[PDB]
Coordinates of C-alpha atoms (C1' of nucleotides) and ligand atoms in Angstrom, one line a residue:
Chain A
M1 CA 0.0 0.0 0.0
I2 CA 1.1 3.7 -0.5
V3 CA -0.2 6.6 1.5
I4 CA 0.2 10.3 1.1
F5 CA -0.7 12.2 4.3
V6 CA -1.2 15.9 4.2
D7 CA -1.3 18.4 7.0
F8 CA -1.6 22.1 6.4
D9 CA 1.1 24.3 8.1
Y10 CA 0.0 26.5 11.1
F11 CA -3.2 26.4 9.2
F12 CA -5.6 29.0 10.6
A13 CA -2.7 31.4 11.0
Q14 CA -1.3 30.7 7.6
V15 CA -4.7 31.4 6.1
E16 CA -4.9 34.8 7.9
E17 CA -1.5 35.4 6.3
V18 CA -2.7 34.6 2.8
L19 CA -5.6 37.0 3.4
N20 CA -3.3 39.7 5.0
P21 CA 0.3 39.5 3.7
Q22 CA 1.3 42.2 6.3
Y23 CA 1.0 39.6 8.9
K24 CA 3.6 37.4 7.2
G25 CA 7.0 37.4 8.8
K26 CA 5.8 38.5 12.3
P27 CA 4.3 36.8 15.4
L28 CA 0.6 36.1 14.6
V29 CA -1.9 34.5 17.0
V30 CA -5.4 33.2 16.1
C31 CA -7.6 33.4 19.2
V32 CA -11.0 32.2 20.3
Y33 CA -12.5 35.1 22.2
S34 CA -15.1 33.8 24.6
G35 CA -16.7 37.3 24.8
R36 CA -16.6 37.4 28.6
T37 CA -13.8 40.0 28.5
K38 CA -11.6 41.5 25.8
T39 CA -8.9 38.9 26.5
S40 CA -10.9 35.8 27.8
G41 CA -10.2 33.0 25.3
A42 CA -7.8 30.4 24.1
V43 CA -5.2 30.4 21.4
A44 CA -6.3 28.3 18.4
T45 CA -3.1 28.6 16.5
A46 CA 0.1 30.7 16.2
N47 CA 2.4 31.0 13.3
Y48 CA 6.0 29.9 13.8
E49 CA 7.3 33.3 14.7
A50 CA 4.8 33.3 17.6
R51 CA 5.8 29.8 18.6
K52 CA 9.4 31.0 18.9
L53 CA 8.2 33.2 21.8
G54 CA 6.3 30.4 23.5
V55 CA 2.8 30.8 22.1
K56 CA 1.0 27.4 22.1
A57 CA -2.3 26.1 20.9
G58 CA -4.8 25.8 23.8
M59 CA -3.1 28.4 25.9
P60 CA -5.1 31.2 27.5
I61 CA -4.9 34.4 25.5
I62 CA -3.6 36.5 28.4
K63 CA -0.9 34.0 29.0
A64 CA 0.1 34.4 25.4
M65 CA 0.1 38.1 25.7
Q66 CA 2.5 38.1 28.7
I67 CA 5.1 36.2 26.6
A68 CA 4.4 37.7 23.2
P69 CA 2.9 41.1 23.8
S70 CA 3.8 42.4 20.4
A71 CA 2.3 39.6 18.3
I72 CA -0.8 40.3 16.3
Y73 CA -3.9 38.8 17.9
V74 CA -6.8 38.0 15.5
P75 CA -10.2 36.4 16.2
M76 CA -10.9 33.1 14.6
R77 CA -12.7 33.1 11.3
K78 CA -13.6 29.4 11.1
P79 CA -15.9 29.7 8.0
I80 CA -13.0 31.1 5.9
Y81 CA -10.6 28.4 7.1
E82 CA -13.3 25.8 6.3
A83 CA -13.6 27.1 2.8
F84 CA -9.8 27.1 2.2
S85 CA -9.7 23.5 3.5
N86 CA -12.7 22.4 1.3
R87 CA -10.9 23.8 -1.7
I88 CA -7.7 22.0 -0.8
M89 CA -9.4 18.7 -0.1
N90 CA -10.9 19.0 -3.5
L91 CA -7.5 19.4 -5.1
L92 CA -6.2 16.4 -3.3
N93 CA -9.2 14.5 -4.5
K94 CA -8.1 14.3 -8.2
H95 CA -4.8 12.7 -7.0
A96 CA -6.3 10.0 -4.9
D97 CA -7.8 6.6 -5.4
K98 CA -9.3 7.2 -2.0
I99 CA -9.1 10.2 0.3
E100 CA -9.9 10.2 4.0
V101 CA -10.4 13.7 5.2
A102 CA -9.3 13.3 8.8
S103 CA -9.9 16.9 10.0
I104 CA -10.1 20.4 8.9
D105 CA -6.4 20.5 8.0
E106 CA -5.4 16.9 7.2
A107 CA -6.1 14.0 4.9
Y108 CA -4.8 10.6 3.8
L109 CA -4.7 9.7 0.2
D110 CA -4.3 6.1 -1.1
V111 CA -2.3 6.6 -4.3
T112 CA -1.3 3.0 -4.8
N113 CA -3.2 2.8 -8.1
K114 CA -2.4 6.4 -9.2
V115 CA 1.4 5.8 -9.1
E116 CA 1.0 2.5 -10.9
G117 CA 2.2 0.9 -7.6
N118 CA 5.7 2.4 -7.7
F119 CA 6.8 4.0 -4.4
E120 CA 9.1 6.6 -6.0
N121 CA 6.2 7.6 -8.4
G122 CA 4.2 8.4 -5.3
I123 CA 7.0 10.5 -3.9
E124 CA 7.1 12.6 -7.1
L125 CA 3.3 12.9 -6.8
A126 CA 3.7 14.1 -3.2
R127 CA 6.0 16.8 -4.6
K128 CA 3.6 17.8 -7.4
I129 CA 0.9 18.1 -4.8
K130 CA 2.8 20.4 -2.5
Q131 CA 3.5 22.6 -5.5
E132 CA -0.1 22.6 -6.7
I133 CA -1.4 23.7 -3.2
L134 CA 1.3 26.4 -3.0
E135 CA 0.6 27.7 -6.5
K136 CA -3.2 27.6 -6.4
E137 CA -3.9 28.5 -2.8
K138 CA -0.6 30.0 -1.6
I139 CA -0.8 27.5 1.4
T140 CA 2.2 25.5 2.4
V141 CA 1.8 22.0 3.8
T142 CA 3.7 19.0 5.2
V143 CA 3.3 15.5 3.6
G144 CA 4.2 12.0 4.6
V145 CA 4.7 9.1 2.2
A146 CA 4.7 5.6 3.6
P147 CA 3.1 2.1 3.1
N148 CA 0.3 2.8 5.6
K149 CA -1.7 5.6 7.2
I150 CA -0.1 5.6 10.7
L151 CA 3.4 5.7 9.3
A152 CA 2.7 8.5 6.8
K153 CA 1.4 10.6 9.7
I154 CA 4.5 9.9 11.9
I155 CA 7.1 10.9 9.3
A156 CA 5.0 13.9 8.3
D157 CA 5.0 15.1 11.9
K158 CA 8.8 14.6 12.1
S159 CA 9.1 16.8 8.9
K160 CA 7.0 19.8 9.8
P161 CA 7.0 22.6 8.7
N162 CA 6.8 22.6 4.9
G163 CA 8.1 19.0 5.0
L164 CA 8.1 16.1 2.6
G165 CA 8.8 13.1 4.8
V166 CA 9.3 9.5 3.5
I167 CA 9.5 5.9 4.8
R168 CA 10.2 3.3 2.1
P169 CA 9.3 -0.4 2.7
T170 CA 13.0 -1.1 3.0
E171 CA 13.4 1.2 6.0
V172 CA 10.0 0.4 7.5
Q173 CA 11.2 -2.4 9.7
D174 CA 14.2 -0.3 10.8
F175 CA 12.1 2.8 11.5
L176 CA 9.6 0.8 13.5
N177 CA 12.4 -0.3 15.7
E178 CA 14.1 3.0 16.2
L179 CA 10.6 4.4 16.7
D180 CA 10.1 5.8 20.2
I181 CA 6.7 5.0 21.9
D182 CA 5.4 8.6 22.4
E183 CA 5.9 9.2 18.7
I184 CA 2.9 6.9 18.1
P185 CA -0.6 8.2 17.2
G186 CA -3.5 7.2 19.3
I187 CA -1.7 7.0 22.6
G188 CA -2.4 9.7 25.2
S189 CA 0.3 11.4 27.3
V190 CA -1.3 9.5 30.2
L191 CA -1.1 6.1 28.4
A192 CA 2.4 7.3 27.7
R193 CA 3.4 7.8 31.3
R194 CA 1.8 4.7 32.9
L195 CA 3.5 2.7 30.1
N196 CA 6.6 5.0 30.0
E197 CA 8.2 4.1 33.3
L198 CA 6.5 0.7 33.7
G199 CA 8.8 -1.2 31.3
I200 CA 7.9 0.1 27.8
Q201 CA 9.4 3.3 26.4
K202 CA 10.2 2.1 22.8
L203 CA 8.0 0.4 20.1
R204 CA 9.8 -2.9 19.9
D205 CA 9.4 -3.2 23.6
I206 CA 5.7 -4.3 23.5
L207 CA 7.1 -7.2 21.4
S208 CA 9.2 -8.6 24.3
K209 CA 6.5 -8.0 26.9
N210 CA 3.3 -10.1 26.9
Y211 CA -0.4 -9.2 26.0
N212 CA -1.6 -9.7 29.6
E213 CA 0.4 -7.0 31.3
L214 CA -0.6 -4.7 28.5
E215 CA -4.3 -5.4 27.9
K216 CA -4.7 -3.8 31.3
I217 CA -2.4 -0.7 30.8
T218 CA -4.1 0.5 27.7
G219 CA -7.0 -1.8 26.8
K220 CA -7.3 -4.6 24.3
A221 CA -7.7 -2.2 21.3
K222 CA -4.6 -0.2 21.8
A223 CA -2.7 -3.3 23.0
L224 CA -3.5 -5.1 19.8
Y225 CA -2.8 -1.9 17.8
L226 CA 0.7 -1.5 19.2
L227 CA 1.3 -5.2 18.8
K228 CA 0.5 -5.0 15.1
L229 CA 2.5 -1.9 14.6
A230 CA 5.6 -3.3 16.3
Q231 CA 5.6 -6.3 14.0
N232 CA 4.9 -4.2 10.9
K233 CA 1.5 -5.9 10.4
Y234 CA -0.7 -2.9 10.7
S235 CA -2.5 -1.8 7.5
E236 CA -5.8 0.1 7.8
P237 CA -7.5 1.2 4.6
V238 CA -8.0 4.8 3.6
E239 CA -11.8 5.3 4.2
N240 CA -13.5 8.7 4.3
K241 CA -16.0 8.7 7.1
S242 CA -19.1 10.9 7.4
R243 CA -19.4 13.2 10.4
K244 CA -21.5 11.6 13.2
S245 CA -22.2 14.6 15.5
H246 CA -22.8 18.3 15.4
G247 CA -22.4 20.5 18.4
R248 CA -22.5 24.1 19.4
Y249 CA -20.8 25.7 22.5
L250 CA -21.3 29.1 24.0
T251 CA -19.7 30.8 26.9
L252 CA -22.2 32.3 29.4
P253 CA -22.0 36.1 29.8
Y254 CA -21.3 35.2 33.5
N255 CA -21.1 32.1 35.6
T256 CA -24.4 30.8 36.8
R257 CA -26.4 27.8 38.1
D258 CA -29.7 29.5 37.1
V259 CA -31.4 27.4 34.3
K260 CA -33.7 30.4 33.5
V261 CA -30.5 32.3 32.8
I262 CA -28.8 29.5 30.9
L263 CA -31.9 28.4 28.8
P264 CA -31.8 31.1 26.1
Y265 CA -28.2 30.2 25.3
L266 CA -28.8 26.5 25.4
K267 CA -31.7 27.2 22.9
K268 CA -29.4 29.3 20.8
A269 CA -26.8 26.4 20.8
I270 CA -29.5 23.9 19.9
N271 CA -30.7 26.1 17.0
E272 CA -27.2 26.4 15.6
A273 CA -26.3 22.7 16.2
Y274 CA -29.5 21.8 14.3
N275 CA -28.7 23.9 11.3
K276 CA -25.6 21.9 10.8
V277 CA -27.3 18.4 10.9
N278 CA -28.1 17.0 7.5
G279 CA -30.9 15.1 9.2
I280 CA -32.7 14.3 12.4
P281 CA -30.7 13.4 15.4
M282 CA -31.9 10.5 17.6
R283 CA -29.6 11.6 20.5
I284 CA -29.2 14.9 22.1
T285 CA -26.5 15.5 24.8
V286 CA -26.1 18.6 27.0
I287 CA -22.6 19.6 28.0
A288 CA -21.9 21.9 30.9
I289 CA -18.4 23.4 31.5
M290 CA -18.3 24.3 35.2
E291 CA -16.5 27.1 36.9
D292 CA -13.2 25.1 37.1
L293 CA -13.5 24.0 33.5
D294 CA -14.7 20.5 34.6
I295 CA -16.9 18.9 32.0
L296 CA -20.4 17.4 32.7
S297 CA -22.7 15.8 30.2
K298 CA -26.1 14.2 30.2
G299 CA -27.6 12.8 27.1
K300 CA -30.7 10.9 25.9
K301 CA -31.1 8.8 22.9
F302 CA -34.6 8.0 21.6
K303 CA -36.1 5.3 19.4
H304 CA -37.0 8.0 16.9
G305 CA -35.7 11.3 15.6
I306 CA -35.9 14.5 17.7
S307 CA -37.5 17.7 16.2
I308 CA -35.8 21.0 17.0
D309 CA -38.8 22.1 19.1
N310 CA -38.6 18.8 20.9
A311 CA -34.9 19.2 21.4
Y312 CA -35.5 22.4 23.4
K313 CA -37.7 20.6 25.9
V314 CA -35.4 17.5 26.2
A315 CA -32.3 19.7 26.5
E316 CA -33.8 21.9 29.3
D317 CA -34.8 18.6 31.0
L318 CA -31.2 17.3 30.7
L319 CA -29.5 20.5 31.9
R320 CA -31.9 20.8 34.9
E321 CA -30.9 17.2 35.8
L322 CA -27.2 18.0 35.4
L323 CA -27.5 20.8 37.9
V324 CA -29.2 18.2 40.2
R325 CA -26.0 16.1 39.9
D326 CA -23.6 18.9 40.6
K327 CA -25.5 21.1 43.1
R328 CA -22.8 23.6 43.9
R329 CA -20.7 24.7 40.9
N330 CA -21.8 27.5 38.6
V331 CA -21.8 26.9 34.9
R332 CA -19.3 28.7 32.6
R333 CA -19.8 27.4 29.1
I334 CA -22.7 25.5 27.8
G335 CA -22.9 23.1 24.9
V336 CA -25.1 20.6 23.0
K337 CA -24.2 17.6 20.9
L338 CA -26.6 16.1 18.3
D339 CA -25.8 12.6 16.9
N340 CA -27.2 9.2 15.9
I341 CA -28.5 11.1 12.9
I342 CA -31.2 9.8 10.6
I343 CA -29.5 11.0 7.5
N344 CA -31.6 12.5 4.7
Chain B
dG1 C1' -23.2 -15.9 31.5
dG2 C1' -23.6 -12.9 27.6
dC3 C1' -26.4 -10.3 24.2
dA4 C1' -28.5 -5.8 23.2
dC5 C1' -29.0 -1.4 24.4
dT6 C1' -28.2 3.2 26.8
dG7 C1' -25.2 6.5 29.2
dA8 C1' -20.8 9.1 31.0
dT9 C1' -16.2 10.1 30.7
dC10 C1' -12.0 11.1 28.4
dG11 C1' -8.3 13.0 24.2
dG12 C1' -7.0 15.4 19.6
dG13 C1' -6.9 19.2 16.3
Chain C
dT1 C1' -3.2 32.0 37.7
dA2 C1' -5.0 33.4 33.8
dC3 C1' -9.0 29.4 29.7
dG4 C1' -12.7 27.9 23.2
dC5 C1' -14.9 25.3 20.3
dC6 C1' -15.5 21.2 18.3
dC7 C1' -15.0 16.4 16.8
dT8 C1' -13.4 10.8 17.6
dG9 C1' -14.0 6.1 19.5
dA10 C1' -12.8 3.1 23.3
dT11 C1' -14.2 1.6 27.7
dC12 C1' -16.6 0.8 31.3
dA13 C1' -20.7 0.9 33.9
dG14 C1' -25.7 -0.2 34.1
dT15 C1' -30.2 -2.6 33.0
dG16 C1' -33.4 -5.9 31.1
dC17 C1' -33.7 -10.1 29.1
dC18 C1' -33.3 -15.3 27.9
Ligands
LIG401 N1 -6.3 23.3 20.6 C1 -6.4 23.4 19.2 C2 -5.6 22.8 18.3 C3 -5.8 23.0 16.9 N2 -6.9 23.8 16.5 C4 -7.2 24.0 15.1 C5 -6.4 25.1 14.7 C6 -5.2 24.5 14.0 O1 -4.6 25.4 13.1 C7 -5.8 23.4 13.3 C8 -4.9 22.4 13.0 O2 -4.2 21.8 14.0 P1 -2.7 21.4 13.9 O3 -2.3 20.4 15.0 O4 -2.3 20.7 12.6 O5 -1.8 22.6 14.2 P2 -1.4 23.7 13.1 O6 -1.9 23.5 11.7 O7 -2.0 25.0 13.4 O8 0.2 23.8 13.1 P3 1.2 22.6 12.6 O9 0.4 21.4 12.0 O10 2.1 23.3 11.6 O11 2.1 22.1 13.6 O12 -6.9 22.9 14.2 C9 -7.7 24.3 17.5 O13 -8.7 25.1 17.1 N3 -7.4 24.2 18.8
LIG402 CA1 -3.1 18.5 11.7
LIG403 CA1 -1.3 21.4 10.5

DNA sequence: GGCACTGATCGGG
DNA sequence: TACGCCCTGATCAGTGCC
């Protein structure tokens, strides 16, 4: 098999640069402003100049402003980044037997048939692809080219930014050995630690250990997954999957336990979640982010689809029950998730 | 026991 | 210290059933 993985570079920030070339060359930070104050929010992405100063995705905006006070801070414009991505996924399309759009800024392409099976052919194709995206969209990207999906992702990651990473079959068995454990996709930094010290810290190490003492450190799924990787017998197909859920989250104007206060926002979230569903969800979940950023959810799945008007009543019921569960913490952000969709 | 179903928590981009 | 929004599947717990 042959896979071309594609990950757009500092994507949201790079798009703001294509849209405003003055931003290029200088610290730039794309921020999610909660609305609560003029700086409440989280960083979504920073360009590499901003990363040089310590700016990190996920970090609170005021934190970012203490270490990079002269960076440009811009509000997120997700619809524009979504467009950019749609357009690029379309370009990748014509180069792929199959394309699995993994997220807003990355995809896997099975090019086995396209390159007439030849590995080097595919490498050249990876090159032509990086050029097309730069020429057409002025976006730079990192690619990986390996016999499977997981490997293409690993060498791409080691090759950011603007990289063209490559693992040939020849060097697959080697790379898998020299492969550290944390460099593996699908293994949390918690799974890391509790595996890290406790015997395993490299990828060939699961090999020497036995499934028992591992099926309880990470579960059967991850255990078998690592096992297969370690012996180079992993090969999942490139398969595009449809979205299964559609959510909306809002920050409350102020922290509260008062359902009468929260309800209008919850309704607004329901309305906007619904407008994203290409169907009728059979399950609605309510998600409350408490004062301390702890996350509570209550959901309900029916035997039939849920109309929007119905969702309001169910959602208010679920939220009201959540607050019974907690009893003392105010809510900070509220969210709703719609899934188990009856597709049109 | 173990199937079939529902429900809550947690991690990645 | 500081704090958004959105999507995933695994896992485990629970319940009713035969
Ligand atoms: N906590 C996060 C992490 C990521 N994203 C969004 C913005 C990112 O730009 C985009 C892609 O995530 P990446 O991990 O690929 O990060 P970048 O593209 O921004 O940088 P790079 O891939 O060059 O390392 O997803 C986000 O909103 N919030
Ligand atoms: Ca990515
Ligand atoms: Ca990226």
